[PDB]
Design goal:
part of a larger assembly; 6 chains; alpha+beta; 5-stranded antiparallel β-sheet; 7 strands; extended; virus like particle; virus; virus-like particle
């Protein structure tokens, strides 16, 4: 009987995140676009957004020759038989639009500045890696954001706090 | 009275994510490490993880000279003194360790392969950029993972599916 | 019995400065930030200010190898046994924000220009230097500002008067 | 009707500083010295101090090409013909002299070590920069010293405490 | 079922050491100095001590390629799979200062002689080691000092007794 | 009347360490080995541990020609009349042995990994030093370990946290 963990027992306590179904709407209204970002990368355009303010999400997947080099494992004994790994990447570019119409001129005044986001998950290709492992670490990042607290980890990063926990 | 949106009204429907409190445990047990990894960043080590299996999280914040060059927006009619924005990045590196004991010899056998994750959010520095705006796009990415479904966007990416939506 | 003074008896007369408790509010709401300015320098962010208009204060302390070289003491006899000294520095960067909302467009009009301040106190490391000495000279600078008079030393500097007293 | 603040309403509570009138005595007894110390500055000598223990104050004012580059402000939507500001600097150098008389020989023994201080205030040249704005930030620094407390911010800096607030 | 011990059952009897909370005060008042002492070694200044009477503690950690070689293990077979181990080191340098005013001149006469201390713990980096094992060996050293007896192991070493027990 | 201190009043609060009487057992069972480790250094074998699983403690004492040079003392005058000092060192080498019987053959599998510890105290050899002074500095190190809290200074060093306090 072999037990596999991330080094510490998964915390029992659970933060609940009520996340809007952005993905559902985008999935319904998503339309293909050129694979410009990478040959292994397919860019999509979300049709739900107006033509003059587009939101686009680009998915990519790239093999990594050696996972262990980038990462920190203390002893060479522990290395798995193949160090080959796979890395996934979701890139998104959206536009925050503020608009109102001028009283003097019927023309609408429209100022829209851009925001972009990227998520990445890389993992060794080995029979030991479970979807349990990969999903747990996705959740690990999401938790690390501390989204529940309004002035939390994410807002401190946004304001410019490099050294977060001390 | 200004209507400011991302181009489409935020979906009413909400996916609920029960996420373990990884961040709480890490914040309790997080210890500072010298920022070898970045010039303007801060790398932390999680003490909860066993000493031969370290887990590390690295925060960084870098400002961006021109936000509009990357992004696809109809170039717009509002004066901007500068057009520069702040980009926050979170990099985590963890270890998925699988361990057992050799039946022949009581000394255990350990194989641990590495997994890593990275989240990034860049936004134009502007007065009109709200928390509402920024946080919404963080949630937008999280939803885009389709974490609720076992056979979701994230597992397709992990399996190697570039053209996720079609 | 040895007497030590700054060369002239401290003036009995006292200017009273009613200074708002900026420091109390900042101390309550101060949050750590990267030590980017110097390795011996810790930068802090004041959370009381809004995220889109941050105020930041950065403290630093640097040893000075030889204090006497910079300063003017008439005779070499008088030099203390060690010329090693210590220098402290408080740097602050805040933002003066003027805002009103446009009648034609709901969008607020926000113009905020920056202001910054720096205080520095360097002193020889020697058993002779008292906190009495250092505090007196801090007060000496503050008095030198002539804050009580509305059109005084500080406003003359601000307007551009190099030769103040003649 | 425009609300112009530093991001947070000025604290009502006021720390009262009883500061000796050093500046009054110095202004009475201040004599001009040739500005060896700066190209665009003015160095003065205080005649009240004994001749073998000089005390000097040096005023300087230099304009600054671009105020916004140093400071951290969301780059903003208001036309600026130029963005340049004026920076005032006050440098004082004084001597803390400890003197006694040798008991053996009536001739006295004197050891005097040096102390120096510098105050600086830079502000964007703009119409909206008030005295209210500038003076407030001068007071802001003075408060930040926490001079009332014997074991205050200033003494911690002098002792060598970089991370003052946490 | 494997049984691991140091070689002898831990003594039930316990010496109680009432140690002043030096570390607490230092932790409160410790200011980061630049890491002159080593590449992986971080030097700390204690601000509680006066600036001209400094007390500094430097922390360090170095991996050792082969633990077994330095240490005495009777047979080769019993060497573990990987002999890479980790070694920690705490260096402290403090000042015992004697001071009294000169009778002839009030200037104090101060002579301060230094005392320094170092603690080191090196352990084979392997899964079998427990914080049980490490902490026990730390306690083992501390006990070996025989601190309770005034003329004990430590005073004898200070007094030059090399061969303590015979 | 001369006053001598380390620089700060000894903290009243006391951490209580319940340390097993390792030293007592060792003192009972210590057998003199030949002093291989040094000329003025006497090495001791602990007979309580089994003969093939040895634990050895070595004591040493070396004079240092000039204490002041190694240590940081701000000014030269304060150096005492003779800088010759004395330095003591306790080295211990013990064995953490893990053993289990082989399933195939009854002959046990043992693998024993080593741990070692070293404690050093150097003090200026001069009249002014007290066993008050020296015993205080020994306790100072011991407190600095933060042994009471499980994940403390020592575990962080073991875990590689060089920059403990910030």
């Amino acid at each position: 009987s072999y037990t596999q963990s991330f080094g510490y027992t998964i915390p029992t306590e659970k933060d609940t995140l009520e996340i809007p179904q952005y993905q559902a709407l985008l999935a319904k209204k998503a339309s293909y676009m050129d694979d410009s970002q990478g040959k292994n990368t397919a860019t999509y355009m979300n049709t739900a957004a107006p033509k003059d303010q587009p939101e686009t999400i680009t998915f990519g997947v790239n093999k990594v020759d050696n996972v262990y080099k980038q990462s920190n494992v203390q002893n060479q004994t522990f290395y798995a038989s193949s160090s080959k790994g796979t890395k996934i990447r979701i890139d998104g570019k959206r536009i925050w639009r503020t608009q109102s119409t001028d009283v003097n001129t019927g023309l609408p005044v429209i100022v829209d500045c851009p925001l972009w986001t990227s998520f990445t998950l890389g993992f060794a290709d080995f029979t030991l890696v479970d979807d349990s492992a990969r999903k747990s670490t996705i959740e690990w990042m999401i938790s690390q954001l501390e989204l529940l607290k309004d002035d939390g980890v994410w807002s401190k990063l946004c304001s410019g706090v490099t050294r977060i926990y001390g």
